[PDB]
């Protein structure tokens, strides 16, 4: 009957079962799920299966100065228009499945190391197109509640950097993953450290630190050495702009303690100019590829001192067994210094 017919909005709402209880509690292993479609997309007002032509609706009202009259397309002509519409209908469907590849991260099914774009513009149109955002951890934590039982939120740890020394990190939490991405991405832009790079490609000196139970041992390296570090450190180093460094992480691999410990050490390092001012002496550099040629990298800003820095006969430095163990002639692991792709 014509009186038992409902609108498309009501037909799709029921058929899709989106508002149904089962979907809300996630009680189905979603597959082969119905996909909504708009059926008025390619329909032109005035076009029917019978192929009638209506002046002023689906055909020109006046043609070559002649006032048109009602007409109908021939069976052959109608079969052509019907065929052309089918081609357009199929063309749209194939485009729906077509997608644009995005680079994966550390693994194919993980969010770690995935670029999610720049942070959003600021209050006064402060664009951050020069900044890139990378994900370091996505966790599905749970808070037990009386109303909802186990309740799930998305906790995202991201880092941001412009590749020119400025970088920061933040954590964003929400019930939806997309929201946690926005919260963390725009929060991290408010916590930008500036990291000092020696000659724009490496740290000024070796850095050893313990943050909580995570240990990091970074080493200054020459050009062309590349990043040989934890995958998270490679991601953060690319954001900062460091190009050549070695690092080892031991103890707990907590991503937050590694991110906080990394920025802590990298932000509290000492540039050569700072050391020259503190001690009043020239800072000289000796490269083995330049021979004995002395290279002055920093000169004291004020008055140059005349008391030589004391050189002990035997220094009391505290050495790490791992570094010293190599020069003692002990064997390294089979996993050490394996051939890897350029980082």
């Amino acid at each position: 009957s014509f009186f038992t017919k409902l609108t498309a909005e009501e037909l799709w709402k029921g058929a899709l079962a989106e508002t149904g209880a089962g979907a809300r509690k996630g009680r189905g292993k979603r597959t082969k799920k119905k996909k909504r479609k708009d059926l008025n997309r390619g329909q032109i007002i005035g076009e029917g299966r019978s192929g009638f032509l209506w002046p002023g609706l689906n055909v020109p009202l006046i043609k070559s100065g002649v006032v048109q009259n009602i007409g109908q397309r021939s069976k052959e002509e109608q079969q052509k228009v019907e065929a052309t519409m089918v081609e357009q209908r199929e063309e749209w469907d194939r485009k729906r499945k077509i997608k644009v590849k995005r680079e994966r991260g550390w693994s194919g099914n993980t969010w770690g190391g995935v670029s999610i774009g720049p942070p959003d513009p600021g209050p006064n149109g402060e664009t951050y197109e020069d900044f890139d955002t990378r994900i370091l951890e996505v966790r599905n934590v749970f808070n037990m509640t009386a109303k909802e039982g186990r309740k799930k939120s998305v906790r995202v740890l991201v880092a941001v950097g412009n590749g020119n020394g400025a970088a920061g990190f933040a954590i964003g939490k929400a019930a939806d993953r997309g929201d946690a991405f926005r919260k963390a991405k725009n929060r991290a832009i408010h916590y930008l450290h500036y990291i000092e790079r020696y000659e724009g490609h490496t740290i000024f000196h070796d850095i050893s630190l313990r943050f909580k139970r995570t240990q990091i041992r970074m080493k200054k390296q020459p050009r062309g050495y590349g990043l040989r570090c934890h995958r998270a450190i490679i991601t953060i180093c690319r954001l900062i702009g460091i190009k050549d460094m070695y690092a080892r992480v031991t103890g707990s691999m907590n991503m937050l303690n590694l991110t906080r410990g990394l920025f802590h050490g990298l932000a509290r390092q000492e540039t050569h100019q700072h050391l020259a001012d503190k001690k009043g002496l020239h800072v000289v550099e000796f490269r083995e590829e330049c021979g004995p040629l002395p290279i002055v990298v920093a000169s004291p800003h004020g008055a140059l001192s005349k008391e030589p820095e004391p050189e002990p006969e035997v220094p009391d430095t505290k050495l790490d067994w791992q570094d010293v163990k190599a020069m003692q002639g002990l064997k390294r692991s089979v996993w050490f210094n394996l051939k890897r792709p350029a980082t």
Binding site: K29, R30, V100, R104, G105, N109, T110, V154, R177
Partner: peptide, 14 residues
């Protein structure tokens, strides 16, 4: 546990 993976983002279905 399956649809929260980056598959949809890494394919381009945005």
């Amino acid at each position: 546990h399956r649809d929260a993976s980056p598959r949809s983002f890494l394919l381009g279905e945005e």
